[PDB]
Design a binder for this molecule. Structure first.
Ligand SMILES: Nc1ncnc2c1ncn2[C@@H]1O[C@H](COP(=O)(O)OP(=O)(O)O)[C@@H](O)[C@H]1O
Ligand SMILES: Nc1ncnc2c1ncn2[C@@H]1O[C@H](COP(=O)(O)OP(=O)(O)O)[C@@H](O)[C@H]1O
Ligand SMILES: Nc1ncnc2c1ncn2[C@@H]1O[C@H](COP(=O)(O)OP(=O)(O)O)[C@@H](O)[C@H]1O
Lengths: 69, 194, 50, 199, 341, 361
């Protein structure tokens, strides 16, 4: 027999209710850098149906680069 | 396979090779005997190559029939690889006529009915037969070989050629080349008529 | 079930890959977590089948 | 109208290759903007004929995954012996950035050689048909291709810049799945995109 | 007979795969095989105890780990890159007018193996090999010589030192085996096409510096030098640029031969051209001479490939016949290929 | 098969002799012995044990860090085994058998003799240095054209009277995985000391001895070891090396061992090289070859060939037989090849003068 599955193994997740968390609203200079994350996070997660309606498949592509800054 | 197939192109390598690889032991002794017919095309490449590995065998019967399979079909044309191969052949300590039958019959592959005036000098053969007859000492087989090389050496007068260029086959040789394959006492004598 | 549950411990079981076969009827196969073995027929599936 | 004769005639016809008397075309390329569809043309024509498709290196870990170490192109040449007809491709080295005029040469040299030694193992010796190679570039190495090409051995085809012709239909091709009404104007949607790319 | 049904139990039931490593001179062979497990085998059968040799593989018992048999296993990238086989159908009757060049190498391709006698009747021992070169890009016309050499012995063609430059040495070693596996295939012939070593500069992947690439070519000859190797593998070598090679490669070998490739003359182009169009049927007005008579400084590849452009349009119309009205006009494309390209 | 039949017969006595000594695995180096009964041994299986011996082994006969046999159940001490490393790259580098003796000399007399007094003259009689010695010298230096390098080693190959010495190939010293050959050059000398004075020769010592350095970035750094590492192998007091050494190179650089050789080595001599005379012996290496036509003259051709080395002028006499077989010429006349010689010298001196003087300058 297999697991339920599962309690799994490592980490796992949380890190918010068990902390830490930091408010992003302090830094507004990244607004145009958040423009991607704006459309590329919330609706991709909360709507899989809209991607059937538009005729375009949601990408998994996200990048970051440059540090520092 | 020897007699039943006569053609310009060999084409018999598949069957001649199949019978030796699929054949039972002790049969490989008589396998090379087909070389007196289908090897008249290009014996230079196939014969000395194959029989080279079988010429070093310790069995006197397969050794007798190896230098024999070469025999007349390879004595039409000369080469340096043969003359350079003559070394170490007569230096073996092995007894029985097979040794002086291996070496002396190999001496007859230099030419057939050619010379000596015109062309090749006879002094070289005289020096070879004089230096090779000093061993054993007798061992009268050395008095058998010193006349043996001059059988075909000093007879001449007959160009063969093959026999033959018109493609008859010599009806004496083959018959006589068959009997000594087991030569015990007198049967190799009836083959001397050559 | 118990018989195969009896069979399978004293030995285990694995999955091999044949890299060659032998004239002696053996077969060249690796034990993949470890070094290779060479093992024989195995009379159900013949050499020419694989 | 050009590459199709390069592909299908070795697949369908070849008994009439000798009727003409020439062997298989050794390769082909499309040079121009980098650029869109040349890699589609590669795999699609490979799919059009169903002949299998192969690429060039390949990182990092497709190398020793076949064999251990070697010139390493022979095993790839052995791959095509298992599956024929086959399509091999240079992915990508279509760019002006890899040049460096030296440091990219040797990096490209074996990418150039990956066709050469294969052309030398296609035409030079071995066998037989159904194997092909593809190149892509813009400029520079296209003239450096002439260093490799005093006629030996390839086929030279140019990759076109986009034009309003495709812009209409290739958008209509992408417009199949999307939800849109019929009243959209094709004139302005095409002509508002001069230059740019196929992407 | 009974021995087969006797020792099969000692072999039995299975047997492992070991790696033959080293020997106690008493013939107790210490091996390192996964993971680093040794043993001591003096066993009487199947050996040939000597030649199995260090640096090989073995097959070991489970109890206890005696090697009862051994194999030679490749496959491998070693044997694969040398072969197979081939002997493509082209001959040395294809290239005419340069026979003066090949009649030189005729004795060089002939005398080893075929017609060996007058080598040793002179006894002067000229087994020095060959070197090749010529303009502008040639060496497939010398492959037209090499495709003829396939009538005799066995051959391998290699390209460049690339297998060394792919990574930090690694030595020559992939050349070493390619050199000494030609001894395993001896007698044979091996050729390396258009040595780019220091002719080309930059490397693929990671390599450096110059001296390690310099010495892998220096070791290439010094292994071939050699100490002291009779093995042939008659060595054919070529590069179209005589400059970049270290001039010391000539003296050890090949000393006597580096072939000069002359560019085609007017009648050589005539002698070469018709061999192609022999199969491709020309139209009535098509003439070999006038076109190549006016054209200058061509290549055998072009004059072979100038027929392919007619193999497009006539084949686009699906016609078995060449037309000079196109072959003239289409030649401009290959003319544009040489002119502008 | 009578070999194969007797070959499977004694496996009975092999299986009876199998049970004892079979578990002698694994080859294991020891660590320390605190007192009489105790030992601690360490293996590469990861097994590390502080454990006792089998009674057949005496304590004082054993060395620390010594590969031994063991019965891994008791973890006894079965027998110590001397050897450690190295794999077949040694057995490739290590060489045997003779060939190419003295008489292949191309006429060089005291060029080889000055180095014949250094190597085999002391090896003929190591007793020669009992009375007078002092020492057989430390090292030598050799360089020049190819002719004739490594054949003087081949001359030492056939004329070696004691044990088969070890050639050294250059590009196997330079390796990936920094310090590969670093172990070798160190450890192979004990493997050479295992042969008790059996000589060694290094080839391409200029390539592997690379000198000197650039600021950045090496590159040569890991190889900067090997040179000074060999200098450490040179700076090892013992023997050194009981093999003396013989070293052939091309250019004066590398300088560091070449400026270390006055700090250790001796006997800087030189090729030989072409001479007005010795060419007649390089033309008498073909003397007994062929059959020299009664009117063929050496001095006639010898005076016509400057800076000949030995290489091409060996083929120079050979390219007679080239055109001989081609033109059917039964034997060759000196006029035949000297036509192609003045060709083959010029035709091959048109592009290449082979400036040996320039190579080391
Ligand atoms: N003729 C064309 N017109 C418009 N878009 C194209 C055309 N050809 C290809 N594309 C688009 O370009 C994308 C990438 O092209 P590709 O052949 O992968 O170029 P590359 O290999 O240089 O990335 C394809 O996914 C395709 O949708
Ligand atoms: N007589 C001839 N018949 C046919 N083809 C010829 C003849 N002479 C030369 N050629 C062609 O000229 C071409 C020149 O090739 P080459 O420059 O050697 O290419 P590579 O770059 O492989 O060295 C050869 O491929 C050969 O086919
Ligand atoms: N005095 C000589 N005696 C014998 N051979 C010589 C002599 N001088 C030159 N040679 C020839 O010169 C060649 C030297 O080549 P090589 O071994 O490459 O030298 P190196 O090892 O120094 O590079 C040999 O083939 C050798 O036959």
């Amino acid at each position: 027999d297999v697991l339920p599955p599962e309690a799994d193994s490592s980490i796992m997740m949380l890190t918010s209710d068990q902390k830490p968390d930091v408010m992003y609203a302090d830094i507004g200079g990244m607004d145009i850098q958040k423009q991607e994350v704006r459309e590329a996070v919330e609706l991709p997660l909360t709507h899989f149906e809209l991607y059937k309606q538009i005729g375009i498949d949601p990408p998994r592509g996200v990048l970051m680069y440059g540090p520092p800054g | 396979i020897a007699m039943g197939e006569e053609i310009g192109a060999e084409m018999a390598l598949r069957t001649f090779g199949h019978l030796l690889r699929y054949g039972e032991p002790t049969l490989r002794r008589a396998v090379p005997l087909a070389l007196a017919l289908i090897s008249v095309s290009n014996p230079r490449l196939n014969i000395l190559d194959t029989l080279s590995k079988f010429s070093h065998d310790a069995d006197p019967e397969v050794s007798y029939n190896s230098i024999f399979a070469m025999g007349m079909v390879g004595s039409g044309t000369n080469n340096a690889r043969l003359a350079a191969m003559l070394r170490q052949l007569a230096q073996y300590h092995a007894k029985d006529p097979n040794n002086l039958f291996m070496v002396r019959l190999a001496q007859g592959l230099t030419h057939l009915g050619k010379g000596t005036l015109t062309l090749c000098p006879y002094h070289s053969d005289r020096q070879l037969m004089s230096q090779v007859a000093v061993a054993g000492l007798l061992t009268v087989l050395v008095s058998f070989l010193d006349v043996r090389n001059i059988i075909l050496g000093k007879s001449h007068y007959v160009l063969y050629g093959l026999v033959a260029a018109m493609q008859p086959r010599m009806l004496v040789t083959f018959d006589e080349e068959l009997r000594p394959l087991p030569v015990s006492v007198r049967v190799g004598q009836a083959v001397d008529v050559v | 079930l118990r018989e195969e549950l009896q069979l399978l411990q004293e030995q285990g079981s694995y999955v091999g890959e044949v890299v060659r076969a032998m004239d002696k009827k053996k077969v060249l196969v690796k034990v993949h977590p470890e070094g290779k073995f060479v093992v024989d027929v195995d009379k159900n599936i013949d050499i020419n089948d694989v | 109208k050009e590459i199709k004769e390069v592909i299908e005639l070795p697949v369908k016809h070849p008994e009439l290759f000798e009727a003409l008397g020439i062997a298989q075309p050794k390769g082909v390329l499309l040079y121009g903007p980098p650029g869109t569809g040349k890699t589609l043309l590669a795999r699609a024509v490979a799919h059009h004929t169903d002949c299998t498709f192969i690429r060039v290196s390949g990182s990092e870990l497709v190398q020793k995954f076949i064999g251990e170490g070697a010139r390493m192109v022979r095993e790839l040449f052995v791959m095509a012996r298992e599956h024929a007809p086959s399509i091999i491709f240079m992915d990508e080295i279509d760019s002006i950035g890899s040049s460096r005029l030296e440091g990219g040469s040797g990096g490209d040299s074996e990418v150039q050689r990956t066709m050469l030694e294969l052309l030398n193992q296609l035409d030079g010796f071995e066998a037989t048909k159904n194997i092909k190679v593809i190149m892509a570039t813009n400029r520079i190495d296209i003239l450096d291709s002439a260093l490799l090409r005093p006629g030996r051995i390839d086929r030279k085809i140019e990759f076109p810049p986009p034009n309003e012709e495709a812009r209409l239909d290739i958008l209509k091709i992408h417009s199949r799945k999307m939800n849109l009404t019929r009243g959209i104007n094709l004139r302005k949607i095409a002509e508002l995109m001069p230059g740019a790319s196929g992407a | 007979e009974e021995e087969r049904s006797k020792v099969d139990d000692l072999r039995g039931t299975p047997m492992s795969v070991g790696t033959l490593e080293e020997i106690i001179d008493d013939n107790h062979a210490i091996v390192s095989t996964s993971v680093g497990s040794e043993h001591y085998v003096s066993i009487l059968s199947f050996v040939d105890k000597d030649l199995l040799e260090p640096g090989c593989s073995v097959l070991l018992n489970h109890k206890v780990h005696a090697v009862i048999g051994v194999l030679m296993d490749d496959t491998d990238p070693l044997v694969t890159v040398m072969k197979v086989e081939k002997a493509p159908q082209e001959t040395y009757a294809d290239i005419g007018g340069l026979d003066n060049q090949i009649q030189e190498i005729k004795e060089s391709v002939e005398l080893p193996l075929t017609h060996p006698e007058y080598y040793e009747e002179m006894g002067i021992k000229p087994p020095k090999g060959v070197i090749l070169y010529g303009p502008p890009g040639t060496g497939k016309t010398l492959l037209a010589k090499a495709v003829a050499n396939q009538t005799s012995a066995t051959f391998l063609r290699v390209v460049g030192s690339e297998l060394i430059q792919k990574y930090l040495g690694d030595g020559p070693k992939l050349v070493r085996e390619l050199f000494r596996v030609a001894e395993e295939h001896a007698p044979s012939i091996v050729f390396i096409d258009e040595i780019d070593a220091i002719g080309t500069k930059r490397y693929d992947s990671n390599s450096g510096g110059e001296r390690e690439i310099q010495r892998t070519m220096l070791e290439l000859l010094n292994q071939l030098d050699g100490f002291d190797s009779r093995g042939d593998v008659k060595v054919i070598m070529a590069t179209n640029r005589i400059e970049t090679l270290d001039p010391a490669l000539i003296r050890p070998g090949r000393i006597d031969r580096k072939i000069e490739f002359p560019l085609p003359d007017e009648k050589t182009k005539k002698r070469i051209f018709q061999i192609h169009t022999s199969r491709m049927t020309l139209a009535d007005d098509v003439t070999l001479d006038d076109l190549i008579m006016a054209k200058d400084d061509l290549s055998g590849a072009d004059i072979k490939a100038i027929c392919t452009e007619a193999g497009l349009m006539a084949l686009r119309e699906r016609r078995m016949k060449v037309t000079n009205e196109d072959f003239k006009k289409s030649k401009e494309n290959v003319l544009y290929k040489k002119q502008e390209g | 098969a009578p070999p194969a039949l007797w070959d499977l017969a004694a496996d009975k006595q092999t299986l009876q002799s199998e049970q004892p000594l079979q578990v002698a695995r694994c080859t294991k180096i020891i660590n320390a012995d605190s007192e009489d009964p105790k030992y601690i041994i360490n293996v590469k299986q990861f097994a590390k044990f502080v454990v006792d011996l089998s009674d057949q082994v005496a304590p004082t006969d054993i060395e620390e860090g010594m590969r031994v046999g063991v019965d891994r159940n008791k973890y006894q001490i079965h027998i110590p085994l001397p050897p450690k490393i190295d794999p077949t790259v040694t057995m490739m580098q290590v060489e045997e058998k003779p060939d190419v003796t003295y008489s292949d000399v191309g006429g060089c007399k005291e060029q080889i003799e000055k180095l014949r007094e250094v190597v085999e003259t002391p090896l003929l009689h190591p007793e020669r240095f009992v009375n007078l010695g002092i020492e057989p010298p430390k090292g030598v230096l050799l360089f020049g054209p190819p002719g004739t390098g490594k054949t003087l080693c081949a001359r030492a190959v056939a004329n070696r009277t004691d044990a088969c010495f070890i050639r050294v190939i250059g590009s196997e010293l330079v390796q990936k995985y920094v310090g590969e050959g670093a172990r070798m050059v160190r450890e192979l000398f004990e493997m050479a000391r295992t042969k008790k004075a059996c000589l060694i020769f290094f080839d391409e010592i200029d390539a592997i001895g690379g000198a000197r350095f650039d600021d950045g970035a090496g590159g040569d750094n890991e190889v900067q070891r090997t040179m000074l590492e060999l200098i450490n192998q040179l700076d090892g007091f013992d023997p050194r090396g009981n093999i003396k050494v013989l070293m052939a190179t091309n250019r004066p650089d590398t300088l560091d061992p070449a400026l270390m050789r006055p700090g250790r080595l001796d006997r800087k001599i030189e090729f030989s090289l072409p001479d007005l005379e010795g060419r007649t012996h390089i033309f008498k290496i073909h003397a007994r070859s062929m059959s020299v036509e009664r009117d063929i003259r050496f001095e006639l051709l010898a005076r016509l060939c400057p800076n000949s080395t030995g290489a091409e002028i060996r083929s120079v006499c050979t390219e007679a037989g080239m055109f001989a077989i081609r033109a059917r010429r039964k034997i060759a006349t000196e006029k035949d090849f000297l036509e192609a010689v003045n060709k083959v010298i010029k035709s091959y001196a048109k592009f290449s003068a082979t400036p040996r003087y320039m190579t080391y300058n």
